């Protein structure tokens, strides 16, 4: 959670932090998985990240995403109180719960 | 006062942010120079800071340096009400106003 120090000659110092570029395509309703595509699909993470702590992050985005037209999903039948603690699941494109350039989202496990 | 971002291959991404050691050897008073010498002289500061700026960061460090210890600078004749709003002057060894290797902190200008 902290950058790595790498000095150099003449005293100078650069602080180097690393990332990785992931987009969630979401999985958890089909009615809104494209304005959750659009609003919250972008992430940069570090690369020590585990995917467990990776969920939460994409936890409140979409929560924080959603609560201002909470109003407009209680129709569609979706209650944000029962999305705000529900589980989130991650996996790259074979299915591993390990980060990769493209994921999904889903409150499901990846199947088999 | 922001890092730079450098994106490779695989969507990896680095986040750079470059400083400079700077260590200070400071003229303001000939008795108690040794202890800020050894408390509050070593500084890492971006390589875009500006020196009036980085007098400021010195400043508050020197002051915060000496604070809890202010009821011994009374008998020394140190006022640190006085100190705490002085003029701070920075300059490298040959005595120009740009950030270096070593510096020299004191309350008057680099004579010449
Ligand atoms: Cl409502
Ligand atoms: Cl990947
Ligand atoms: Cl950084
Ligand atoms: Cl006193
Ligand atoms: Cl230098």
Known sequence: ???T???????????????????????????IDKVLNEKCSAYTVE????????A????????????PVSELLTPLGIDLD????ATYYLFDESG???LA?????SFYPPDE
Chains 1, 2 share one sequence.
């Open 5 to 31: 120090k790498v000095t150099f000659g003449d005293d100078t110092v650069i602080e180097v932090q690393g990332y990785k570029s992931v987009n969630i395509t979401f999985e958890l309703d089909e009615r």
């Open 96 to 98: 591993e719960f390990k």
């Open 47 to 54: 690369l020590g990240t585990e995917v467990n702590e990776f």
């Open 82 to 85: 029962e999305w705000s603690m």
């Open 101 to 105: 350039s493209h994921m999904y989202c």
């Open 1 to 3: 959670g902290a950058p």
């Open 56 to 67: 939460c992050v994409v936890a409140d985005a979409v929560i924080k995403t959603l609560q």
